[PDB]
């Protein structure tokens, strides 16, 4: 029974750890992500006004 | 036990492979273990394989993949050209040395890459070869120009003082017919296991 309880709990813990890691990764990323208007405008300027790194293949 | 004997025995000794017997790509070294018979054993069609081999084969050497297949025939090819290339190379007597400044691998988890040469030459570079006429400085070998030159079972890069027009331009793409002499300078060996010879055309 004890062994079975451990097995049940260990997997859950691992899953929790994975979820936390994923969250951490998302947080690390999220400086690039946009919510506000000003950030969106800045992103647009970076993309369009620079005239650099247009994804076109050759 | 029987199992131990089987593991020891001469068919177990031939390391298995399912590489093509017909490979039209670039051949830099032997693909398959060459297998010879004696003349007596050939006469009664026995090669030391699972089955008898067809009486049509009169060559003593061959190469194989499968002892027996679903088609009820051993997958073989009656040819052992690779031994003759090695023997030609030995005759030429140009010792293979690594052009890169490195120690000779034969002196002192697993690495599948080719340890120095593949074993076509265990010759050492420091020797001279005397004869009645004297000590041979320049190794004279006959070869054929293709367009590169075929020199004793190896293709080799070639150089000369002046490009001779009389021999070349008379027969532009039948240069393979006429055998020319060559002075082999040195033989280097690359990572892929290709022997990169370098010759010089003599006239």
């Amino acid at each position: 029974k004890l062994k079975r309880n451990y097995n049940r709990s260990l997997l859950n813990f691992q899953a929790h750890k994975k979820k936390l890691n994923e969250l951490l990764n998302l947080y690390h990323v999220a400086n690039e992500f946009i919510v506000t208007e000003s950030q969106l405008l800045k992103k647009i300027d970076k993309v369009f006004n620079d005239e650099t790194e247009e994804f076109t293949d050759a | 036990t029987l199992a131990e004997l089987l593991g020891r025995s001469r068919i177990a000794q031939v390391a298995n492979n399912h590489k093509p017997l017909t490979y039209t790509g670039k051949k830099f070294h032997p693909t398959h273990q060459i297998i010879e018979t004696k003349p007596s054993t050939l006469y009664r069609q026995e090669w030391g394989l699972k089955s008898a081999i067809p009486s049509k084969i009169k060559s003593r050497y061959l190469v194989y993949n499968d002892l027996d297949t679903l088609e009820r025939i051993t997958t073989f090819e009656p040819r052992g050209g690779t031994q003759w290339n090695r023997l030609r190379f030995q005759e030429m007597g140009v010792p293979i040395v690594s052009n890169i400044g490195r120690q000779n691998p034969f002196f002192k988890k697993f690495n599948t890459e080719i340890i120095g040469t593949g074993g076509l030459s265990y010759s050492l570079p420091g020797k001279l070869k005397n004869s009645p006429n004297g000590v041979i400085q320049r190794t004279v070998v006959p070869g054929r120009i293709l367009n590169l030159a075929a020199i004793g079972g190896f293709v080799a890069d070639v150089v000369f003082f002046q490009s001779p027009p009389s021999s070349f331009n008379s027969m532009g793409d039948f240069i393979r017919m006429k055998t020319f002499l060559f002075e082999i300078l040195e033989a280097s060996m690359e990572k892929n296991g290709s022997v990169s010879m370098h010759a010089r055309l003599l006239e």
Binding site: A15, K19, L23, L24, L26, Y27, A30, N31, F33, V35 | -
Partner: protein
Amino acid sequence: EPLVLSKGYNIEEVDKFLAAIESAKRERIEKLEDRREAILRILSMRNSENKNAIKMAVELARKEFERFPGDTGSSEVQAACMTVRI
């Protein structure tokens, strides 16, 4: 409910985790708040699929009915799990 999250997350726990990360970074504001908001939006129920919501409901039902924490096949809990799907 308003600050409920998908993907087996909990909003209180997420905030605490973010705070811990911040503390670790300091050891080794507006922007940080914006990032946190973005994360919440990503992990919110209302932006996620219905499937996640159903899964959450099933989990809740299981928690309610389980005659002990380990059991998930309890005839009653099975029935409860069926009900949410139904």
